[PDB]
């Protein structure tokens, strides 16, 4: 974050990164140049000495296709909020679902990771139209104790009776919903719950998954001290985990764990394991691995603005009828990255 | 905006806003998350004692749809200009049509309003390829007397005989045209005029509206003193007001009026009324309300960088065959917004 | 550029321009409003005394179409690199292919020019996934002598056997390739340059377009430049094999490209310019044989108010004829006048 403005009670931080990034894989849909950049603005204004206003916007700009290519940029975040002393904060916009308050603890790999869930995937990650109340250190009474309460209105179909103004396809639709999170402290533990109504299209068009509500239950653990980082994340889902392109898993059990070490000279090796186990899938699928891989990588930090990394995704999925029909990659991937950040 | 750069005779201002915005309506194409942001740059260079150069770019970035959604960002403004002492200024680019010099006076509602016209709508709002000459205080000789002269070259069809490089659909096309405005802060009075050629596609593809020329005639009045803001605008148009999706109104009579009070502690209540009366519509439509509503709302300004608002569009249109076939919404809307501004 | 941040060893230069721009032409696909803007960031971090990290992003935002129009903005450059003192620099991302190291010398017209090649056109201009090594002054041993070494992985088709993640159409595809450049600033203002590149072609390039067949794309370039005493002269000659676009018809099996320009910079701000460009395709299939792919004279001028504001006129005097080749290839044969007014930061 680069502070480019600080005057008359308002401050502007520009931030982002340019990632010179290349994948090598036998999977032709992921193989090759993956260069992209992120640019963002973070602003806050002191209204009075107890009230602060703020806004944040974050933009992704792909740079791996041509100048005539289509749909190469999109907004990751955009929200405005108010925070009042110890009474908490409230923001609204496109922001992270509060489930990520805990699952982000394992989303720290050099390149891969964080993919037992997706974006626009109920309240598991970045989401449209979330209203989020947060409180740090429980009103100033319990150090290290944080919680959040979140509401999301329906984001429905493009047309018909299920429509909203901002309609999308069924895999990124949501009904009215809410979520909570709680975290507590160099060992931390955390929990999160989310619950969203599912839409009619979601319960009629996809081949897999039927249920009134999408629900997630998460617990997580983190150790962060002495240049060691250990983290684990266990999430049980109902009608909320995508079964690739086929729909949603009626039930899934998602597990992420990671171990990293920071050498003083800048090298940060990382080792991790991720699995998403789908249960009670229709069509004879039954129990199926939705995700399963070991990840071995390393990032070298030249300083806080320059790094380079390699990441090896060791894919442990078998190619079977489920991964084939669902469009799920079973190939290994090697990622090489050179990153300038500000 | 925020001056982020001022060196060796050149200054840059960064400006914009993040609007956490939600609509509540029975109209499913309107109801839902409407979060968006704006970002712009305004540049100005001192060339010599009397001549300054300038440029400005304004970008709208929607943030209410997914990261895989399309067509989510667009340029509202982009122009470059020169200003010479009291002799006036010239600029060319994507800029406001001079009709907005007067109609902007009623475009002050918390969220709604300004919609008896649209963008890329001849010289009524933001438009491609406008060359604009402006003079304030009449060459320095008459305080408060401003005028503008403006030319716009054809923006034609995508292909065929009527094409230009930057072709678009008939509803946002224009032929060669020109406009003039005059405003006098005598309490202000304003008048504006525009005259454009229509295009062959406007006279053949849509069902409604036929004529060689699009014209508008605008008069406006503004009271802005003693914490009170009152404004009205009346615009008579020919072949220039859109009849929703069905074409243009051969004649239309547009009227906007607003009354507002600014409380010292930040609250700014607002009441307004807008109507657009189409005349001589083809296909038996005859005379039709194209727009008709009363608006009640309020903005609370925390400071220059943070505000919040409610706006209530009390829609007075009757649901009939014209509003149905033309895609014109007849439902009330409530907007809630929280805005961070830089 | 405008340096808007420089702290803790990291600096950010925000740069760009807003070009109020209008074309006049009998070609209705060219005529009319052409207003656009560029915006970009050039960033740089001093890692230690000898080692610098850097990144650069450049965005093009059209402003000549409506707010409901599609695909109006795009990324021209995005790369990150390291410079290790006199050992050289390495960057990767979307960047210029090293052929442009020499052909850029003629890319100086007020509005037109630089179009015997295109973008995403092997290593001839801006390109996806280029890894570029550069060395100035030959490890610090020979002032004025620069060279570059570049590699580009395949950017393939959208679907099927030749696909990559970042697929595109045949005119903008490439196989694995490499290029090299070498320039020497001879004395007071005279430079000579050479560039070479060699890429594999893709299957769709050998099947979808009507013209051009070959396993390999190859370019050979030499250039000359004079840049002193307010005079700017430059020329470049490039011979290509399976690498110059023949409009929408495909690729020319061979092409011979030539550009030459002469400009003078008045101190009061006026910069007149005259130039000539041609691209001659040879051995085209389907009876075309030898054809002019590009041929025009350019006359224009730019007036600099200062470093942040300018205006120009540019007049493309098009010498191509309307024939079945130019018709079927979609190549414009009409004259064009451009009028621009530019704010720069
Ligand atoms: C403000 O005045 C608006 C009303 O004036 C009407 C303009 O007259 C139109 C002139 O041509 C119309 C021919 O019927
Ligand atoms: C000129 O002043 C315009 C008068 O306001 C129009 C509102 O009344 C319209 C009823 O036809
Ligand atoms: C002349 C005083 C201006 C009156 C404006 C009042 C706005 C009322 O809206 C309140 C809701
Ligand atoms: C003071 C401004 O008050 C505006 C009224 O707000 C409308 C509330 O919307 C409720 C309608 O169902
Ligand atoms: C020798 C002919 O082979 C064609 C080479 O294609 C370009 C790939 O070269 C990359 C090796 O550095
Ligand atoms: Mg179920
Ligand atoms: Mg008429
Ligand atoms: Mg050949």
SS (H, E, C) B16-43: EEEEEEEEEECCCCCCEECCEEEEEEEE
Annotated binding-site residue? A210: yes
**Which method resolved this structure?**
X-ray
CA angle A330, A335, A336 (to 5 degrees): 165
Q: Which of C174, C176, C192 is nearest to C184 (CA)?
A: C192
Distinct helix (H) and strand (E) counts, chain B: 2, 20
Phi, psi values for residue C15, rounded to 5°: -140, 170
CATH number at residue A214: 2.40.160.10
Binding annotation of C for Mg(2+)? 213, 242, 253
- Rounded distance between C-alpha atoms, residue C52 and residue C42, angstroms: 13
Longest distance between any two alpha carbons in chain B, whole Å = 64
- The bound ligand whose nearest atom lies closest to the alpha carbon of B255 is 2
Query: Are the C-beta atoms of residues A132 and A101 closer than 8 Å to each other?
Result: no
CA distance C87 to C105: 26
Q: What is the DSSP string of B277-330?
A: EEEEETTTTEEEEEEEEEEEEEEEEEETTEEEEEEEEEE-----HHHHHHT---
- Dist CA A11 CA A5 (whole Å): 5
Kindly report the CA angle at A245 between A240 and A251, in degrees rounded to 5?
Answer: 30
Q: In this structure, what are the phi and psi dihedrals at residue C105, rounded to the nearest 5 degrees?
A: -60, -30
Does residue C249 sit in helix, strand or coil? helix
Smallest CA separation from ligand 2 atom 11, residue: B253
- Return d(Cα A240, Cα A209) in angstroms, integer: 9
Tokens of B147: 């005028």
Q: Are B113 and B271 in contact (CB under 8 A)?
A: no
The tally of CA atoms less than 13 A away on the side-chain side of residue B216 is 36
Q: Chains meeting A at 3+ CB pairs closer than 8 A?
A: B, C
Establish if C84 touches chain A: CB-CB under 8 angstroms. no
Asked if the Cβ–Cβ distance from C32 to B155 is below 8 Å, we say yes
- Token readout for C179 is 């290029």
Question: Taking CB atoms and an 8 Å limit, are C28 and B165 in contact across chains?
Answer: yes
Give the separation between CA A156 and CA A170, rounded to whole angstroms.
Answer: 8
User: What is the C-alpha separation between B324 and B250, in angstroms, rounded?
Assistant: 19
Residue located nearest, by CA, to atom 7 of ligand 1:
B217
Find the CB nearest B32 among A47, A94, A153: A153
Report whether C23 contacts B155 (CB < 8 A).
no
Alpha-carbon gap, residue B220 to C324, rounded angstroms: 57
From residue C221, give the alpha-carbon distance in Å to each of A68, B145, C94, C152.
27, 61, 22, 19
Which residues have CB under 8 Å from C36's CB, separation 6+? B78, C19, C21, C60, C61, C62, C63, C64
**Buried/exposed C193-223: b ≥16 CB within 10 Å, e otherwise:** bbbbbbbebbebbbeebebbebeebbbebeb
A26: left (phi over 0), alpha (psi -120 to 50) or beta: alpha
Cβ-contact A73, A40 below 8 angstroms: no
Pocket flag, ligand 4, residue B269 (CB < 6 Å) = yes
* Distance set, CA A135 to CA A85, A132, A153, A317 (Å): 10, 10, 22, 40
For C11-52, give the secondary structure using H, E and C. EEEEEEEEEEEEEEECCCCCCEECCEEEEEEEEEEECCCCEE
Contacts of A249 (CB under 8 A, 6+ apart): A208, A209, A237, A239, A240, A241, A242, A243, A278, A279, A280, A281, A290
Whole-number Cα distances in Å, B212 to B157, B174, B198, B215, B276:
16, 11, 5, 10, 22
Nearest-5° Cα angle at B259, B255 to B265: 150
For A257, phi and psi rounded to 5 degrees? -145, 145
DSSP state of A163: B
Question: To which residue do tokens 């007075």 refer?
Answer: B316
Supply angle C-alpha B219, B220, B223, rounded to 5. Answer: 160
Instruction: Look at chain B and report how many structural domains it folds into.
Output: 1
Residue A190 in tokens: 């955390």
Nearest atom of ligand 2 to the alpha carbon of B219: 1
The token duo for B171 is: 């509803």
Chain C: nearest CA to A241, how far in angstroms? Answer: 24
Query: Cα–Cα–Cα angle for B97, B102, B104, nearest 5°?
Result: 80
Q: Name the 3-class secondary structure at C270.
A: strand
Query: Among residues A80, C113, A46, A310, which one has the least CA distance to residue B309?
Result: A80
Q: Where are the beta strands (DSSP E) in chain A?
A: 2-7, 10-25, 32-33, 36-46, 51-62, 73-84, 89-96, 126-135, 145-152, 177-184, 187-197, 213-225, 228-242, 248-261, 267-281, 286-301, 306-315, 333-341
Structure token digits, residue A28:
């032709």
Whether C264 contacts C246, CB under 8 Å? no
Nearest alpha carbon to residue B225 among B257, B190, B189, B188: B188
Tokens linked to B82: 């020169």
The helix (H) or strand (E) run that includes residue B235 is strand B228-238
User: In 3-state terms, what secondary structure has residue C329?
Assistant: helix
* Structure token digits, residue B129: 């390829």
Residue nearest to atom 12 of ligand 1 (CA): B238
Question: For residue C249, what are the CA distances in angstroms to B146, C80, C166, C205, C246?
Answer: 55, 36, 23, 11, 6
Question: Which residues partner with B20 through β-bridges?
Answer: B338
C177 contacts chain A (CB < 8 A): no
**Closest CA of chain C from B318, distance in Å:** 28
Q: Do C308 and B43 touch (CB under 8 A)?
A: yes
Given the structure tokens 């955009």, which residue do they identify? Answer: A78
Name every chain B residue with its beta carbon within 8 A of the beta carbon of A62: none
In whole angstroms, give the CA distance from residue A99 to residue A257.
Answer: 16
Bridge-partner residues for B164, per DSSP?
none
Helix (H, G, I), strand (E, B) or coil at B244: helix
CA distance C82 to A265: 18
Instruction: State whether residue A79 sits within 8 Å of chain B by CB.
Output: yes
CB B275, CB B264: distance < 8 Å: no
- Ligand 5 mean position, distance from CA C57 (Å): 29
Domain residue limits at A264:
1-342
Which among A251, A244, A250, A254 has a CA at the least distance from the CA of A322? A244
Question: Annotation-wise, does A250 bind a ligand?
Answer: yes
Q: Give phi and psi for B288, each to the nearest 5.
A: -140, 140
């Amino acid at each position: 974050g680069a502070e480019i403005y600080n005057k008359d009670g308002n401050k502007l931080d520009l931030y982002g990164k340019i990632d010179g990034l290349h994948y090598f894989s036998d999977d032709k849909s992921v193989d090759g140049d993956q260069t992209y950049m992120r640019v963002g603005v973070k602003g806050e204004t002191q209204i009075n000495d107890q009230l602060t206003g703020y806004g944040q916007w974050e933009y992704n700009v792909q740079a791996n296709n041509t100048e005539s290519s289509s749909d190469q940029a999109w907004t990751r975040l955009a929200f405005a909020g108010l925070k009042f002393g110890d009474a908490g904060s409230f923001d609204y916009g496109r922001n992270y679902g509060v489930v990520y308050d805990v699952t982000s603890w394992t989303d720290v790999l050099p390149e891969f990771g964080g993919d037992t869930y997706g974006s626009d995937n109920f309240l598991q990650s970045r989401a449209n139209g979330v209203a989020t109340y947060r409180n740090s250190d429980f009103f100033g009474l319990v150090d290290g104790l944080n919680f959040a309460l979140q509401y999301q209105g329906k984001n429905g179909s493009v047309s018909g009776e299920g429509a909203t103004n901002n309609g999308r396809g069924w895999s990124k639709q949501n009904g009215d919903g809410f979520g909570t999170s709680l975290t507590y402290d160099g060992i931390s533990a955390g929990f999160a719950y989310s619950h969203s109504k599912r839409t009619d299209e979601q319960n009629s068009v996809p081949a897999l998954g039927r249920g009134d509500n999408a629900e997630t239950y998460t617990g997580g653990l983190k150790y962060d001290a002495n240049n060691i980082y250990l983290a684990s994340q266990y999430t049980q889902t109902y009608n909320a985990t995508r079964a690739g392109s086929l729909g949603f898993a009626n039930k899934a059990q998602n597990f992420e764990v990671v171990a990293q070490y920071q050498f003083d000279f800048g090298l940060r090796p990382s080792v991790a394991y991720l699995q998403s186990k789908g249960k009670d899938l229709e069509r004879g699928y039954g129990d199926q691995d939705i995700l399963k891989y070991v990840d071995v990588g390393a990032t070298y930090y030249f300083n806080k603005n320059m790094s380079t990394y390699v990441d090896y995704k060791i894919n442990l999925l078998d190619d079977n009828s489920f991964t084939r029909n669902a469009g799920i990659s079973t190939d290994d991937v090697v990622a090489l990255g050179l990153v300038y950040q500000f």
